[PDB]
Each structure stands twice: as structure tokens, then as C-alpha cells.
């Protein structure tokens, strides 16, 4: 809520903590897609051999 | 002597062979250890941050 002044002093908070969750779950995607890299690079080369 | 000839050189082809197989076997442990070291690289480099 808005309508006081009440509503956006704690919108503020709601806000903050909402980005703080997003972010964390943006990092732990990323490093899941840096070991699937790495994965299918040694499979590569296994394969090769 | 040939039947004694002819055993030496039967041995020999297949020695030939079993050096090639002890090529292979250091070829895949090379490769596997190469990854290794690659992902401990880059966990230092994170580390230093």
C-alpha cells in the first residue's frame, strides 16, 4: 500500500528483501551452468581418446 | 633353427601390440588429469577475490 506514508516506509523493506532472494537464486543458476561447461568438455576429450 | 626363428618372430608382433595398449592407458590418465587442474585454476583465481 501507498495511500500513507506508513505503506511506502515499509514497501522499502518488502523491496529489499525481494531483491536480495532474486539475486542469490540468479548466482546459484549461473554456477550450475559453468559445470555443465566444464562437463561436457571432458567428455569431449574422454570420447577423443 | 627356423622352427626357433619363427617362434621369435611370432612373439615379437604380438609384444608390438601390448606396448601400443601401455601407450593408450598413459594417453587416457593424462587427459582425465588435464581437467583437473584446469578447474583447480580457476578455483584459485576466485579465491584470490
Redo the contacts between chains.
Keep these: 500500500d501507498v495511500s500513507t506514508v506508513l505503506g511506502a516506509q515499509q514497501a522499502l523493506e518488502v523491496v529489499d528483501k525481494a531483491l536480495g532472494a532474486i539475486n542469490s537464486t540468479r548466482a546459484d543458476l549461473g554456477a550450475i551452468q559453468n559445470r555443465f561447461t566444464?562437463v561436457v568438455?571432458?567428455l569431449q576429450?574422454?570420447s577423443e581418446? | 633353427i627356423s622352427e626357433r626363428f619363427g617362434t621369435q618372430i611370432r612373439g615379437t608382433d604380438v609384444a608390438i601390440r601390448n606396448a601400443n595398449d601401455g601407450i593408450?592407458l598413459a594417453?587416457?590418465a593424462e587427459?582425465?588429469l588435464?581437467?583437473i587442474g584446469?578447474?583447480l585454476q580457476r578455483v584459485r583465481e576466485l579465491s584470490v577475490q
Aim: charged fraction near 5%; charge should be negative; avoid cysteine.
Design positions: 566444464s568438455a571432458n576429450t574422454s581418446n | 593408450s594417453q587416457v587427459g582425465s588435464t581437467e584446469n578447474n
